[PDB]
Design a protein around this ligand. Structure first.
Ligand SMILES: [Mg+2]
Ligand SMILES: [Mg+2]
Length: 342
DNA sequence: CTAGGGTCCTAGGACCC
DNA sequence: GGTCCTAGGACCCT
């Protein structure tokens, strides 16, 4: 009863798109991210910039210290969305068992496929080749019997490569696999796990499930399972969006309600435009606001509400402004909507 | 020197039983 | 003892 799961993942997605559309950027260090003056961070960088240590989520001031010639780009999201739609249509030529995880990646369950003699290895190769042929972008891929191992595997031979993990290979692969490589085990969990001698899946295998449950709740069951190659999550092609948000970090902290209200007046039309694409009548389940203070604490307050409404969002921001906050400066203002259930 | 787009999980009190 | 409301936080993607 062994499934074949492919994880396909575009290489340096945003930057790869900018280099295709402007070949001058191919061999110099580039990165999509907000300027140092906008207090921005790097969304991604090409390999010439990664050589200097430039990484996704790095504050753009640090990126520029490591790489003084870094060329900064704003991002062309319609171009990325277009390439996203294209590769998903390419996925559809091979199976309908497609679960996109983001613009540039997806799981595919090809267990019941009879393309390429039912070979998941050759399906993954054909997909990567077609993507390059039709979009002039490269992709990497991972092949394994379960989701999380396939996703790990797509990182191991990138860029423009793939890696295959068979059932026979799973135990050796797991023994020294660092826990932090598991999707969903992040910095905080890894440091907790490290703090009591759990670094790798092999370490967790020597652990009692009851103790893992007591100490991490349902997460501890996930840890126990993944450390054994257990991952029964099915590829789900029916996931739907649940929220939409629009927020802006200012170049300078604001200290006056007049400034906050002005920001909201610019954000609201954008939130409405994006809601309207997916819900023309603007009917929703909840709406709310977000403030992030100069000390980086953030608060949200949101409530049942039937339909996008600017004045209520201003009103709610006013309360949050007055009630929470206590004289701090504000670096970010956000608006938020929770979508109806169906 | 710290984005903006999101998903999922937890947890207390309210409410319904 | 379920389920809803709400706030916060870890985590994911580029
Ligand atoms: Mg990628
Ligand atoms: Mg990806």
């Amino acid at each position: 009863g062994s499934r074949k799961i492919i994880h396909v993942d575009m290489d340096c997605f945003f930057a790869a798109v900018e280099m295709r559309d402007n070949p001058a950027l191919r061999d110099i260090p580039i990165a999509i991210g907000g300027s140092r003056e906008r207090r921005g961070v790097i969304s991604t960088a090409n390999y010439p910039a990664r050589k200097f240590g430039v990484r996704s989520a790095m504050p753009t001031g640090m990126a520029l210290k490591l790489c003084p010639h870094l060329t900064l780009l704003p991002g062309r999201f319609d171009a990325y969305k277009e390439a996203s739609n294209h590769i998903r249509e390419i996925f559809s030529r091979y199976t309908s068992r497609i679960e996109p995880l983001s613009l540039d990646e997806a799981y595919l369950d090809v267990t019941d496929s009879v393309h390429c003699h039912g070979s998941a290895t050759l399906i993954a190769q054909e997909i990567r080749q077609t993507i390059f042929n039709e979009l002039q972008l490269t992709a990497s891929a991972g092949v394994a019997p379960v989701k999380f191992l396939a996703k790990i595997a797509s990182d191991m031979n990138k860029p423009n490569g793939q890696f295959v993990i068979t059932p026979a290979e799973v135990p050796a692969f797991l023994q020294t696999l660092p826990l932090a490589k598991i999707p969903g085990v992040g910095k905080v969990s890894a440091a907790k796990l490290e703090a009591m001698g759990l670094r790798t899946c092999g370490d967790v295998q020597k652990c009692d499930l009851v103790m893992l449950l007591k100490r991490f709740g349902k997460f501890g069951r996930i840890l126990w399972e993944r450390s054994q190659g257990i991952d029964e999550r099915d590829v789900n092609s029916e996931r739907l969006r649940k929220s939409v948000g629009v927020e802006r970090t200012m170049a300078e902290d604001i200290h006056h309600w007049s400034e906050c209200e002005a920001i909201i007046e610019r954000l609201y039309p954008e939130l409405e435009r994006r809601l309207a694409k997916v819900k023309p009548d603007l009917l929703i389940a909840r709406q709310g606001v977000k403030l992030k203070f100069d000390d980086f604490q953030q608060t949200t307050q949101e409530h049942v509400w039937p339909r996008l409404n600017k004045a209520d969002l201003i009103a709610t921001a006013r309360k949050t402004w007055d009630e929470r906050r206590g004289g701090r400066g504000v670096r970010l203002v956000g608006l938020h909507v929770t979508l109806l259930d169906p």
